Subunit: 359 residues, 4 copies
């Protein structure tokens, strides 16, 4: 159990950026800039700094060339410079390794703290960042698939309640989760900025990074990304979707970058900023919980995720989940799901929905 | 081979309506009216007559109570009253059974000819029909999922080239097809009204009716149908999609009515009215041909289809396809598909795309 | 200037609901329910309580039958029950008239404070509210024009800087404003919940309520409201739009209810939650500031607005703006606007655009 | 009245392309290619050949550098090569001037007939055309404002009934029109391809070209064109809209190219292909007939339109309309319009709607 510090939690505003290590900078650039249309704030032979259409901070995504593709940092912006000091004291009380750089780890960020958190994830906290031209009315640049914001991260961790408790102490509030009747938790979503999530926990072997999510304005923008990937003959990099989520109610798509980092495209979740925002718990066997239309969840969604680094740049050792597997209990040979609770019509046993089993 | 008659073909305008036999009229009404929003032109204890938002003829769909669910007629409107006489002479020359009713088979249709066509399908040709209020600007009635037109039919038949030649002689032009490199045709689409299709042939045991298709204005309307089916907890009646087609380039969805009659919702195909419109042939192993995003085609899409009736109302006997099966050659045991021609990366051997196999 | 209380400001979450007095309850019901598709949370012969598709608090709009159409209260939800006590102490220190009802003024709200604020507006602060079924996935009920959230209020007041400073003291942060080179402020927008606004000030004679805004998911939903109004042959109740705003970047529409209360439909403004969110100032003569496409702003949009009531239910007296008029300086006889600053081509003099 | 030929009318498929004379080819290129995103089929120092996203024929728009901006030809494609013969005989019987070129007037068109028609318009009829890559699934190229098809032309002509009869004999069917209670016709729309129009007649001084219209897939595509024009700070080239039409029920926008040639962007009209398609007639004083939302029609929309050329490349003389003016009777000093027929409330006297 991760203790609650006496030291006050930093006031976290929102997810702000991720630094992903990539193996081939030019191929990664082709994906994030030419395919997805993100906007370059800075680049050189070592790194590409990218932002979304409506962002004013320096970036939402740093692509860093390195030997092993991995998450290097998931960064949250805090409310004041003083909250970076609060972050440092807080994680020091937790007994985590921390590293503080007054002039930042990446360009366009100032005073920053990186930590190996209690779940093995490299978190960054910062306030100071270089402002850039906010492109929100640059309709001369707007693409048919425009990514307009960074919305959230999603983390794979073996023990969801243990991680949830720690994130609650840090000020994140649970919006939705997935459980079964025998009391196992499979996933939880939690926020600071008044949307369904800023980070989320997916049960699985970890620490691994499940995905980073960007939003679009409208559903047709997500459709266009799919259409464009078809035209580029890279439909094999469309992992899952598009669909409507149960959890979050957002329209969604999952795609894979050249190093298999998973990117979610997302729109039209709901407001969660009231403190008594009603929590929603889904049964793991409800076949509308992940895709509201009942479409099957592709097995790689449950099995594959990115390595994460420690503060030395080495890959974090993975710890196996011992709680039940969502894949197994829903779409594996022993699994089951339902459309209507208690109704055998529209229920699936030992296979996925829509007539498929696991390949 | 079906000979070309000496008698002139009737001048066919478009697909106009289908008559489906249903087993429980109230259950079927709930699907087509309460779920899908079609507009009631007339109903009684035996039939429901339904039209789309932009239609001015009496109906696009007749639901007729009967003991065995089946297609009873697919009806095409012809250009003049005299074209019904032409139809009669044409099909008589083909040696087909025909039935002529000066005052119609169904309400709101006048002088009509029904025929057991050379592929065993019940076709109707008519000109005369009762005009009704055209609801195309009745935005006070417009549904978030509104079906705006009848678009096409799709027929399952064992020998696609045989049927294709007959429909070409009747004046339908093939817009797209699916073939392999060994002389097999798996499917063809053909039109009169200047869209991708008015009827289509899908290879398989037949005669059976694969689907009837209605159009929407925009892609979000199709999304809404899915969303509504989730809210009604009938997502199990979403068979396949939503997607982007390769063939037709339309955005699409397939759903199943209470008797398992398949309905396609469709939007934003392209203009085909020029007489040298380029015919697009897809290779059967191209994994973007049916779903442009490479999502797998659900096996029921290839195996399941509705019975069709003869003019006496008895079910037509099924003739087995002996040509190769699209299912088997793409997703079955010895199947193959590709993302990029000649690339092993993104190819699938003996399974479907996206991590699935046949149940 | 309105002094800052020593008493701590209540922690305001967001705009939550408006109580509008209407003269014919059935006619108003037809507009808000049958035309606009809002969801009934309670109704009787005197009041209709309505909410948007994604709401979980009891209501976003209360229609109350009364003799004179007016705004009766514009209500903000606060973070905790103790914030209602804070609001009471705060407005008492401002010297404002206050009324506290521990069981609420309207159904589905608990302990609530109403105040005649320093600008003459009836504000309510509350925490307690009856939760209802959140309809956000009830796509069986979803309209082609569905209104999904309450987004903001917009207030007409004569001195925008005076009101702005007062709202900033209450914790609202300015996101955008309209000024000229002479130093006049014509309008400001300000927020708590991390969108472009929860309330906004339009320079003019006040206190009057300019509009209440609801959001949709997508731009086609706004189109559909216009299309429906054409089908119902009430297109004369479309006042302005649909358009793209300059300020806020939102897609918008303004329509008029049966008592001439103005309702905005709005979608797709941007995130403002960071405390150093860059503030945008437009020049009043920029013809893309209000409608990005340069469509003219109809004079009624500048001149017409709803009465507001005091705590006794009487109409608040109005104070005339003495600062320059946006209408006069842009589309009046001596006004002007530009498409490109410094270019006579695409400029309009003594005249609106187009 | 224009007589009906004994000679059979050509089978016309659809509107196919327009040739527009422009004064500065580079400025026009910037508008049609960089702003609007049309696809270049061919270009040189004198001409740009452009097509829409879903087209397979060579082009939908030819921009031809010349000294006077004008319509040079509005072209319709016919069903067979023999229909170009039929067209030639038909217009010859009408007593119209004709010119036929076996190798075309512009690149990518083969055997083609141009005529000075009975209303003074330069029509082309052709079958043969060079097929190009259909870009309908090139979503790697797709713009947020993508123009997907050529939809129609709209012609300004002084006597609408006279022109209507002639187009009906030529095989166009009237889908919608605007009349009043005193026997005046102000406008008519007419088709071959099964949409609301392929060409249309707008009452006014003519011959002039009112506009050329291109389709989008969705309404948001039209909104994006407006948004982009705002970002480019050329919102003054937005003339009217966006809106919903009464006539046609399409979502629409009107913009102005660098020589003031008017382009409509259009989507989601309805199917008209049945021969008994119900004709819809609006009253000229109905304020929802042109913009369904009641937004006012700016006077320039009524007064301004492009010159057209004869077969020698000279500007056609303009004949004045003597029938009542739609502008005057609706928004002029003595004009009138209504929201609800018979209701004084929401009516407008001697001014336009919405203030
Ligand atoms: O017309 S404005 O662009 O000034 C504008 C922007 C945001 C609003 O909410 C508003 O009502 C007005
Ligand atoms: Ca082969
Ligand atoms: Cl999910
Ligand atoms: Cl398909
Ligand atoms: Cl119009
Ligand atoms: Fe996610
Ligand atoms: Fe189909
Ligand atoms: Fe507003
Ligand atoms: Fe037009």
């Amino acid at each position: 159990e991760i203790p609650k510090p006496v030291a006050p939690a930093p006031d976290i505003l929102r997810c702000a950026y991720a630094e992903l290590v990539v193996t081939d900078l030019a191929k990664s650039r082709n994906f994030y800039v030419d395919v997805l249309g993100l906007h370059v704030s800075y680049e050189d032979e070592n790194q590409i700094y990218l932002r979304s259409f409506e962002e004013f901070i320096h970036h939402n995504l740093v692509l860093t060339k390195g030997p092993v593709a991995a998450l290097k940092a998931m960064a949250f912006r805090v409310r004041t410079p003083e909250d970076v000091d609060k972050a440092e004291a807080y994680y020091q009380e937790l007994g985590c390794r921390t590293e503080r750089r007054k002039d930042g780890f990446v360009k366009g960020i100032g005073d920053a703290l990186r930590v190996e958190d209690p779940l093995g994830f490299p978190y960054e906290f910062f306030f100071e960042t270089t402002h850039v031209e906010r492109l929100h009315m640059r309709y001369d640049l707007y693409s048919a698939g425009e990514l307009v914001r960074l919305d959230h991260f999603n983390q794979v961790t073996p023990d969801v309640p243990r991680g949830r408790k720690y994130l609650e102490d840090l000020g994140f509030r649970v919006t939705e989760d997935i459980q079964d009747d025998e009391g196992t938790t499979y996933a939880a979503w939690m926020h600071r900025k008044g949307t369904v999530n800023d980070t989320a926990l997916t049960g699985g072997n970890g620490p691994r990074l499940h995905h980073v999510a960007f939003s679009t304005h409208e559903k047709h923008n997500i459709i266009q990304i799919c259409d464009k990937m078809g035209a580029l003959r890279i439909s094999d990099r469309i992992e899952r979707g598009p669909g409507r989520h149960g959890v979050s109610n957002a329209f969604y798509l999952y795609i894979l970058d050249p190093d298999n980092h998973r990117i979610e495209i997302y729109t039209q979740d709901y407001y969660t900023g009231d403190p008594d925002n009603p929590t929603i718990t889904w049964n793991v066997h409800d076949n509308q919980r992940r895709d509201w239309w009942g479409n099957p969840v592709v097995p790689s969604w449950y099995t594959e995720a990115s390595k994460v680094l420690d503060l030395d740049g080495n890959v974090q050792e993975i710890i196996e989940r011992t709680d039940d597997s969502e894949l197994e209990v829903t779409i594996g040979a022993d699994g089951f799901s339902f459309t209507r609770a208690g109704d055998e019509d529209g229920s699936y046993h030992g296979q996925a929905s829509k007539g498929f089993k696991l390949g």
